[PDB]
Subunit: 392 residues, 4 copies
């Protein structure tokens, strides 16, 4: 009747063309799943279902979730499906696992998300039946399937900047949040607050010692307000959104081991956390950046809780302006938001981020002596999802 | 509270480059969803979730389930996700909807699947970071993401012929099943047995009046054993699988409206069917054609039923050899299998087929005065899914 | 000290994607060369040099002239080079052969041109070193290398329409010339005036009798002023140039056998024609359509002849407006211009047209009892070439 | 009236993806032409014709010779054509200019060649009319149009290794020649023997000051027999040709200013060289590496000279084995061959090399107090061209 989280692991997040560029999305998923199973002390052969999110499926091959499962050493006999809720994919994987466990149909599920935006292909839409004559387009699949609205063709970053302008969020407020996101991510790394959650990625090397990637690539200790203030708007000349106050494109994987509260008791397992509730809302595509505060308010109404009952928040930083506006919409103390840093500093590997923020939330709550947390994420197409957890 | 099915609708299935070539997958999904809502007498704004399957997501744009929902006239405020379980996607959308309704989290869900194999793009894996020198491959995304194993690169048709050979299923038995599949589909079309389930597709033209597609394109009244016996093996020169005794590539959409049994009773609705139970199994990728008989045997074990308790079966005809072998494994009377024809005749629009066979099963049971049916489908990667329904 | 033409042959001209679509440019060249050698009664092994024009060389393979030579049965021991003077390529092949013969370095040369605009590839300019991110272009090589200015990117048809507007050539005058070009080409075919020059193309057929293409595909007996007047401008909304009063894209080959006047006497050969003189001029790229009248005036000044000394003209119909304006610039009786039709009706297979108009000129002069002719052609990049011949 | 050479200039040769990667072929041609005009003290507006070679024309835009002419500051009013004789293109441009000047038709021509193998595109042969289904090839245009036989598809390097084997030229002899080619090119650069012929390329930067490229990139002072002997065969596992004893792919331009002997005397010019004679031969495509010795023997027969009458030779080093074998066939003293290095060290920018070896021969003769030289080059498709010059 309730689902517990036994474990939660994430790869470091790599920059576009960076540290993880030679690692497939399914291999990043595999690494995070394998670490999650080891930390849970759960046998790969006892997993009943693998539910995994990824957005840019084109060119990843049949059922990417199954490739991630096999790369983790989960046997062929374990069922799986791949889910796509754009930026929310990795979080909806976890909330679907919760719903299936709650039916009693399964009691042990691996859920999470992966993305290698470095490795997305280019596509040709007219090569099958023929262009016949005239120049046409060769299409960046990250842009076509992940970063632009299927209805308007408008970049997600244009919508982020339109919402910041309508919310009255200044360029300077966005840059101050970007600075604090970097400084919190850098401090979290240096002070050992990401050592527990991260599973390093080992990349075999011809020349000698393998490359071990153990640190988030994108956070910068030398970030300053003065440097951020010099950047030009990146999606729209009239706007306040820059390369500095919004995440770029990234690579990463994250995974959680979920079990029914009953089975966990029977096996003498101490859960990392309990899933208390989740909810999702949907709006027009252009309003997607507004959804995290709305999803939190809906989840508080559903659970009969208020904002003061929550110890920590993770709101995925799709734009600095989203963190800022969600604060005002939900009445959140910013000191309780994204306390180890967020996507502006860390990156937004879109199919992974929903799972990545839950991994981060669990460890941040544990670091602060446990309590109630909410993870909330907006997604392309106009959705918002939120999950409430208790860390003991 | 069990889940009931209020309505079930499908487009006609088109041939590759055929009658539905100018229609997007998401538009075929929209047409099926809108027909299912009208037949259920359900307002589009009362839908609480859309769960939709599609396999070749590359180039379809952000979250294709959302595109299909909007094309049906479902408002922005309705949540959605896109699921990928290769050939089983459209059936897993339905069984996930059943699981979510059984939690009480939602009471009214649209589920189904879509595919436009005619409109899948070509991809370039090296165009992003450069080929540097030497010739390389321009890749058919139906082949890369749908029709070849992610682990070996082997075509699904090679695995179908390998299993047919190991099962001792002759070329002649496969051609006989292919012939009966065509005769049954042609007879169903001619005798009015697909009129109820089909929603015609209207295609506006660059010239005069719109073209109305109201019939499955692939079944052939002129099918003969003589022609089938002359065809060459298509996937492997030593093998028994041909273009005639296996489906080719296809386009189509299918959708069902699901409601809690309690909400249906509350609104005074007469359900079209009840979902009794479902299960899934998984094996090594190369064994995928063996799964439908095993999924059926597992589902009977789970429900404490025997093969004699089931009135009709729909086993997706991934190969004629899968229908034949599944019959032996589950002990099925072939007169109760695919009685209005199956994929060898009708086609295999991969992300839609799992929903399409449920739509067909429901109507085939209604045509015999109701009863208990099982729909079972194998999928790329080595999975098998089965659902048991009751039609009143 | 003078060059004679022993023979002159051309394939029919095919429409884009039409009758010759399955024939490579080098095979069209081969067919025209082989016919020219047969009609000259010259052994393939006695040819000393092959000079062949083609504009869209990309994807044709190493030295296309050598492929055409070998397809004609000319042995490996015969030297060759491929020339590119855009639309003038096939004519400059012949005038270069004249210059080489005049040195005494060679005495027997095959010259002409070929083009298969049906078979030109598409290209990717960034796939080698990588697009990195963002959408880019897949490029029609006919557009990039043949039909647009290398300096401005402007289509040749935009320049044609700007020159017609500045010369004061009406839409109605252009349509009247297009009508007369069609009616003259249709009459030439029906009345046997193209039977001598054409070598049919034989395309082998699985099903039975081969396809023999023996007729120019594009001329239309049902062309009318009323039909032409309804077309919309095709390169530029403000312009008078349409799909009807300018050639499209085409396929074809043409070839001439050239010999020194001395060797022809020694071998007892009756030349078809003598090359008297040639010249070329160059202007800015946008003024290319002006050049044919200027080239004719320069060739008359060079030879001490006047317009009344010339019996027949061939001016390649790059636009109907070019034929009309060249008439006024050179003082030409239109009754002596393009008398068997021209490119508006027949097509413009760009690397062949310069050779094709010389083939046509020779046979038209022969039909009218011999005399002096000039062939003149404008070319992309701003050039004009003219050659004066005598048919005995 | 013979033809004289007033000036001869080349860019440095760049490595594939190296120092000249950001410079178009036509810009390298322009730089060489402008330097040749300045060194000849010839006004750009007095040039009467530009004959320029380039092999990978695909994607370079209309008539690349015209682009190179305009980039040099030659006015629109100067006629031009682009020539393709594969590897011999830049040399055939020069010998065609000689032939045209010998007619008296023109008295002042710029000739030469260019190639940017770094910037050649990739092509799609089926994108126009459609792939329909199945994977296909994205094609490197350097491979398709420059480096493979149009008839067999076999790499030029397979033919070079086949001829080396049949000629009995050991792996060790080829590596010894490779070593001497590097030592000679390095010594020529260090001792000032390329300062006169090179025109540096200035490349404006997206950052600070322009980069000046003034040295050939490919020669290596660190070349050893030890390293050469460890390399694996590159084109064929049984063969003796490696990445070390054959040139790779390269970028460069070269240009010469040619004038009638009579006009040079009239203007009181001191010619840099006189063209005495040239000839060409042709063989089967697979025999192309055998041609330079045969072209030399034919040119000696034509001029009534013997090998003892020639002071220096430039034989383009298509393979080290071609230099060695050509030496045996013509009876050349190797101390008189490629004395400032050759293509194994310097690179093989295919459409420029034939002009580049003439530029180098002229300067190498001037450095030894003048005399008679022969430049000889083999080319893809089975040709060999040789020109004899006298430097005063």
């Amino acid at each position: 009747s309730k689902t517990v989280i036994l474990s939660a692991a994430r790869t470091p997040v790599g920059k576009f063309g960076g540290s993880l560029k030679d690692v497939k999305a399914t291999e990043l998923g595999g690494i995070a799943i394998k670490a999650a199973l080891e930390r849970a002390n759960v046998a790969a052969s006892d997993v009943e279902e693998v539910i995994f999110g990824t957005v840019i499926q084109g060119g990843q091959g049949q059922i990417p979730s199954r490739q991630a499962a096999r790369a983790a050493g989960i046997p062929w006999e374990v069922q799986t499906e791949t889910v796509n809720k754009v930026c929310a994919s990795g979080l909806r994987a976890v909330t679907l696992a919760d719903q299936i466990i709650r039916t009693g149909d399964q009691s042990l599920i691996v859920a999470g998300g992966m993305e290698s935006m470095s490795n997305s292909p280019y596509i040709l839409r007219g090569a099958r039946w023929g262009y016949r004559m005239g120049n046409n387009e060769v299409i960046d699949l990250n842009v076509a399937d992940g970063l632009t609205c299927a209805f308007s063709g408008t970049h997600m970053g244009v919508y982020g900047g339109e919402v910041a302008k309508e919310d009255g969020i200044s360029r300077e407020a966005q840059d101050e949040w970007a600075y604090r996101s970097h400084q919190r991510a850098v401090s979290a790394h240096k002070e050992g607050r990401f050592e527990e959650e991260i599973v390093p990625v080992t990349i075999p090397q011809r020349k000698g010692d393998p490359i071990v990637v153990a640190k988030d690539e994108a956070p910068r200790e030398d970030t300053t307000i003065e440097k951020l203030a010099k950047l030009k708007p990146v999606f729209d000349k009239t706007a306040t959104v820059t390369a500095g106050n919004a995440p770029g494109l990234n690579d990463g994987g994250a995974a959680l081991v979920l079990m029914s509260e009953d089975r966990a008791k029977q096996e003498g397992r101490k859960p990392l956390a309990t899933i208390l509730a989740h909810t999702a809302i949907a709006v027009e595509s252009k309003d997607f950046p507004r959804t995290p505060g709305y999803a939190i308010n809906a989840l508080l109404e559903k659970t009969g809780k208020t904002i003061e009952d929550i110890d920590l928040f993770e709101i995925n930083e799709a734009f600095a302006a989203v963190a800022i506006a969600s604060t005002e919409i939900a009445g959140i103390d910013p000191e309780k938001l994204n306390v180890n840093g967020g996507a502006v500093a860390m990156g937004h590997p879109i199919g992974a981020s929903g799972a990545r923020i839950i991994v981060t939330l669990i460890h941040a709550l544990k670091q602060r002596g446990g309590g109630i947390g909410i993870a909330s994420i907006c997604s392309g197409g106009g959705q918002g999802d939120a999950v409430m957890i208790e860390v003991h």
